[PDB]
Amino acid sequence: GSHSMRYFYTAMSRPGRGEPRFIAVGYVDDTQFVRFDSDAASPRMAPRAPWIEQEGPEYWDGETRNMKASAQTYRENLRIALRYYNQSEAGSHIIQVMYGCDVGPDGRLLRGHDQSAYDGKDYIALNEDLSSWTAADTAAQITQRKWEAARVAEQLRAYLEGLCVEWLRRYLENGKETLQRADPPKTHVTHHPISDHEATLRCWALGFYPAEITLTWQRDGEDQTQDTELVETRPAGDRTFQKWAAVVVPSGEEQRYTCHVQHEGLPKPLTLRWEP
């Protein structure tokens, strides 16, 4: 269906321990394909997916130069941020940035993104119109003023509508065997008595891609949202993901519970129960 390309920058200051660390990663959907770490012995944009390896020296050199330049830029931004928040130079701080594009099945731009955070909180974000900004506080309003004067949003829009989409489509074509393949979950229900009158039912989903999935427990056909323990979707390490949902049920009432699984790789939503 639809796809996304996303770049994530993290800039971490560390006074007394050198210049701020700059780490960048690139994702197509839930698949990482590039990385950069300024702390590496030889900092370069490096491949993390097999389908990006075919790109030539011009690509990798260009990307490496962008990452070094960006590292410089955000090292400056950390100092600027120190000034905007009246903070000392002795403390450690973090700037985060995520930007990129969503395209639909037809490969046309669904929407663009360019949002940043300072110390884990919203700072400034490019609005969906790709022409205006949302600033989270008065510090970010200064940046907003600066960027409105410099028409930065137009450059960002030019990137998000152009190169971002085109290169995303390129990646989607080169990595079609994986990027355009959904792996459905392998599902099953486990049963563990916790006492003579209560038992845990746990609905497992394993080995699915992409990460987006819905697991819900129903009792007598009714959603048990507020009584269901849901763990965070986790990476298995082989590109696929895992998740489970658990509910505590009265002994003898297990069959009144059904687990419902929704995933892109499934032709239709799945229903399963404990099979003693």
Partner: peptide, 10 residues
């Protein structure tokens, strides 16, 4: 491909 169009500061 990352955006190069960056030297824009806060």
């Amino acid at each position: 491909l990352s955006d190069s169009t960056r030297d824009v500061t806060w």
